[PDB]
Ligand binder design. Sequence first.
Ligand SMILES: Nc1ncnc2c1ncn2[C@@H]1O[C@H](COP(=O)(O)OP(=O)(O)OP(=O)(O)O)[C@@H](O)[C@H]1O
Lengths: 285, 280
Amino acid sequence: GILQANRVLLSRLLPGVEPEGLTVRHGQFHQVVIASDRVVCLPRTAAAAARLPRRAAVMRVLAGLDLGCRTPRPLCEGSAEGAVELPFLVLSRVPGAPLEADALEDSKVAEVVAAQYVTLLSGLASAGADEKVRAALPAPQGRWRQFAADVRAELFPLMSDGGCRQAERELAALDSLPDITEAVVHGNLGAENVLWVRDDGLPRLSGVIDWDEVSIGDPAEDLAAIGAGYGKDFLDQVLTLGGWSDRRMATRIATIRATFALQQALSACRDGDEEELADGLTGYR
Amino acid sequence: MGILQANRVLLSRLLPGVEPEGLTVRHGQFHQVVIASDRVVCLPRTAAAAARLPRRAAVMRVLAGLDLGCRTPRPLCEGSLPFLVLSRVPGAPLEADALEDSKVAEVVAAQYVTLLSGLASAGADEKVRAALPAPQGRWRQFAADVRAELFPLMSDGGCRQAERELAALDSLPDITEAVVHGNLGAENVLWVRDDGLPRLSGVIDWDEVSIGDPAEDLAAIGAGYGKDFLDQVLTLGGWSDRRMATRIATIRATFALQQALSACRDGDEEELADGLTGYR
Ligand SMILES: Nc1ncnc2c1ncn2[C@@H]1O[C@H](COP(=O)(O)OP(=O)(O)OP(=O)(O)O)[C@@H](O)[C@H]1O
């Protein structure tokens, strides 16, 4: 296993910590070892290792943004960004737990949760128009067109005929999407990546984790994730509070939201997370 | 009234549904700090601190983008009492006792080295240098203050000793290499314990932050944990040269005077007494 394989390095990074007591999250390029107060990114390949210098820069940039909440802060020295490759990257662990959809049935919880989503997304949006932000973050062109290709190549073989027909309709709409490169976009802003304080009172946003797919892009991508997780009414509340309820935006969200389970399945496929692949392919096989 | 009751409107906005009377308040010189579970609310103690709070928020944002190998209080929200909401750095101070174990001591020293290296590296960044204060001849200004305020409280002998110590200060080169925390005592350095060996969580209380001489931070470490542990840090970090040693000793020798001076201004009689122990 990954803990066993990297036991020597982990003993140095986490002195006195028993390897078996730790946990692992699967990424496309990195395996993420989760300790009590910090996480250790271990590159799966040498190409993944060559990515880590850039990742350290990106996480430092995110750590400087005004989002109203925490992000995983790089615990390397600044010079690690100038390396050709790193054998690891350590980040601070964001405290808190996901919010279950249940909590939103209370309309005061819903308001306060929505407002904090708006602070986060407004900060990401404004940060998108900043050249030092734009310089450190990727900004792929025709990502939608290309995502559709990846789905047809990588996921259709795992689907039923009916599934492929369902997915085809969803993917086809994507070619209508404008290529928006305005905001910092998390790219995977499902409920498990948004952490709230385990404290008395109403939910308070602790921070956001798993920035693997972060880019300069379309804010509708993150709003789509929220809609997929929490449904139309909560989304509409976020859009209203944030000033984003125009029909152009609403339409892009709709289009992207219909692909969001496929985005999850594509991720699970590439990082070998079996259960999340099964979840993602629910109703496509 | 009470500070929690007094600030109840703001607290209800910043911490919705959180019972104010369940909170705690602490303070330093400039700020009343309401402590919540994962964050603190900094409120100005004076009209001066109120006017400077925007500036402080700017500095904290810069510090939040530095690679120090640990956490700092991240600005979450600022408004106008002006207020600043910062992330709460988890963990507790390390007691000197723990350093008696040499494996704990090596690991703790190494983590101080990372922190101090990060501060030093950041000091050569002009965007950092521009955002942070950098006073000229701070040690001469201090010396003038000590003579004006403390000498009258001191014996003749005491004044001889202090005058020597202050002379030594003037001899120092006026270094502006590093980000200097400026108040890096044990209580401002927080640790995760009981999960293997101590891990440095983060560092708090950055009100005295500046571009200056890192000997100042190293002096503070020696004050809190003694010369053996400081020696371990200096050796691990490659700072064990004579030049650094002299600067550290010179700064170290002014800690009692620094305490007496601050105690003399805020009328804290017991810290003024402690500070002046040698000098009267
Ligand atoms: N980010 C934080 N995380 C945890 N505790 C904090 C934080 N900020 C402040 N505190 C707590 O509040 C106390 C007072 O804060 P601090 O020393 O920063 O006050 P201050 O008046 O702003 O400082 P100074 O006297 O240096 O101007 C600290 O000793 C600590 O217990």
